[PDB]
């Protein structure tokens, strides 16, 4: 089918959490700026998902639903297919969205007081999950040598050992510095999780998003004793822009740790019953491969442009190229704006709508995220806008 | 449109869990066995629903979303004009389901130990919620008199004179007795209520499905003072069989007690994102009236012709007329079988799949709660197939 990437959309006054979020930050908003904040494509659903889903409500009754055995050896190909990475069906686990699944792993397997340790800055959920249940967040600040980050392996190695520490929440690829791990890196983070008592939670809902040029790694797949004690969080929302459908692939080798994993999801969230959540996994997985390859080539195509706009405009600012995800990682620090302050400048004065850095950790403070999910006109349009913007700052 | 209550249809290998189940527990099942055991419907949806939700999906975008301003407006006209229940849009706090709200209310507003009062023989869930969580179950048996059901109040005030008992659990109307209150039962409960510190959460999910002969009324619309303390929990699911479109409206009158259960919601399953449950709910609210009201007559059609059956075929099985609901409640008793025994009669010599009584609590062994929300053609089908097990049984 023929995929469209080029045309501007409007979400204005339909539910989106992202433009209701703008409108609520600037009512001022000029009609024809787009944001570029929460994590959720400008861009249509796969057409192929669409004609599914319309398909497949004339054939179903809207009732209690669960997956079929199709859709699990479904979910099983695709990480074969993808990823190189052999699953069991039954290690499949659905919960409703994956950070429903993090604060779930955060209370069934571990207890107030306890640390759980997150590498920041970092997907700002990670630290209500902790935090928010009496959990203790124990950081190990990622180290960002000339805006690339690499991991403190000194000091995680350090961490590991305080008993008091139950788990390492790892986030692959690393939102919002974009980062798609090596499997050097994964290999030393492994050896350090085996020499302790660490549990393995990877959130890998970034997986499918890898930029041309480099390769993601899915973490338990490197290593049989890893593999034992790792949560692995997966979905295809991220992948194919279906957050909205609620539907995510928990996969748990361990039967222990899976079915406590699952006694903790039942007297909490419960299973999730939605009917076309299972559905809108199984048609994008089987049929909107070539969509999501014409849409990592725009992706491509944008986190270039946004950096040569700052090399051509404002160098001081510096937008580099990701190894993964669609979300970029800019560096504002030599703007020499105090993090609310730039906010305030980039909501009222560029109408330039980012996921201001300082909301991932401290680390982020100076940083700004940009969703380079749009098509690269409207990629132009904003960054225009912040030229003007700019200048006019002096 | 033309409504379709006539059509047997069939649910294998496409994940409800109600068809999966029969097949899980008898794998040599008739094909053309129709489940009657849990509650959804085995009619087509509507279809004004059905189209308009194909036509959504060729508009939308199936990202992060959440509730418009029609769309709250929508379940408050809903409230009025079919409950005469005045409620502001404020109140209205979704979940994805209504169990997981009910577990969440157990969560936040009591603590291990403390005990909840619920009114037994009741959905099995409400055990759960309690003793899954550390609370303790206080249980106000129901009086039973020729199969009519009625609240033991001399208990229930006793009960809450227990200072340890945080709150009512009230199931209106109750699953699985099929009994819609009378208002004036619920005064004598309210009093009892706002005599002590109990908090009132009524599951009222099934509230639009009240058979014809009885009207129900919205527990918390009788008292202000009552409502201050009291969330009722509400949902389209049941009136019109999208159980699996997940969209809960919580309705909380109190700012600080919706804001205490909002914050716990958000610590274990979050607010639901799911685009087109919220789109479901707005269109049958405003499209679907008329289809509702032709499925309660279909219903109320059944049950009568259950009724006659067992009059007319096997004298000493009762199965009384229930005043809402479209599960009724059968009692089996003379048949002097015990519930282990009499279920695998059921599932097994009579293939007919009802929820069997003794899942709601020892009151109901003996019963069965067959499930009425079928064409009568396969209710028949379904008597018939009975009526040749009973006479085998002798
Ligand atoms: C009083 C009551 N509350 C809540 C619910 C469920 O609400 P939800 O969580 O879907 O929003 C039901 C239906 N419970 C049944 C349905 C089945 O539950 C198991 C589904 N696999 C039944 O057979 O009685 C009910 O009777
Ligand atoms: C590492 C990571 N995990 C999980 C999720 C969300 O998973 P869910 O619970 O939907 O399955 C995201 C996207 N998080 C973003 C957006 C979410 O906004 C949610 C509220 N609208 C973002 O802008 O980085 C993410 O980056």
């Known amino acids: 089918m023929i995929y469209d990437f080029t045309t501007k959309i409007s979400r204005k006054n339909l539910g989106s959490l992202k433009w209701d979020l703008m409108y609520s930050q600037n009512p001022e908003v000029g009609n024809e700026v787009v944001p570029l904040s929460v994590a959720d494509m400008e861009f249509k659903n796969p057409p192929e998902l ?47 969205g994956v950070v429903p699944a993090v604060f779930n792993a955060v209370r069934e397997f571990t207890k107030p007081g306890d640390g759980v340790i997150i590498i920041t800055p970092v997907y700002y959920p990670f630290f209500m999950a902790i935090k928010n249940q009496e959990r203790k967040i124990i950081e190990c600040e990622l180290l960002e040598k000339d805006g690339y980050y690499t991991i403190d392996f000194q000091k995680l190695e350090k961490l590991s050992k305080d008993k008091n520490n139950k788990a390492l929440l790892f986030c692959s690829p690393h939102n919002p510095v974009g980062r798609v791990w090596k499997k050097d890196e994964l290999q030393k983070i492994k050896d350090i999780v085996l020499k ?12 499918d998003l890898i930029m041309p040029g480099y390769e993601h790694t899915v973490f338990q797949s490197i290593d049989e004793q890893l593999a034992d004690k790792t949560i692995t969080f997966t979905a295809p929302s991220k992948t194919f822009n279906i957050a909205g459908m609620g539907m995510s692939n928990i996969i748990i080798k361990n039967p222990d740790i899976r079915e406590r994993f699952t006694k903790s999801r039942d007297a909490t ?64 620090r030599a703007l020499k704006m105090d993090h609310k302050a730039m906010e305030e400048f980039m909501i009222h004065k560029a109408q330039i709508f980012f996921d201001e850095g300082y909301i991932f950790g401290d680390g982020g403070i100076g940083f700004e995220r940009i969703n380079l999910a749009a098509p690269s006109s409207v990629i132009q349009e904003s960054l225009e806008r912040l030229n003007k913007a700019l200048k006019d700052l002096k």
């Open 269 to 332: 969230s419960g299973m999730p019953f939605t009917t076309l959540g299972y559905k809108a996994c199984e048609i994008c997985y089987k049929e909107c491969g070539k969509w999501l390859d014409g849409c990592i080539k725009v992706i491509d195509k944008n986190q270039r442009i946004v950096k040569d706009f700052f090399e051509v405009n404002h160098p001081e600012i510096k937008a580099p190229l990701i190894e993964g995800t669609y979300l970029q990682w800019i560096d504002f």
């Open 196 to 207: 302790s008592d660490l549990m393995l939670w990877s959130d890998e809902i970034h997986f």
């Open 50 to 96: 669409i004609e599914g889903l319309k398909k497949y409500l004339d054939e179903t009754v809207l009732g209690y639903t669960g997956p079929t055995e199709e859709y699990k050896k479904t979910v099983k190909k695709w990480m074969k297919d993808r990823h190189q990475w052999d699953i069991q069906t039954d290690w499949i686990i659905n919960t409703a």
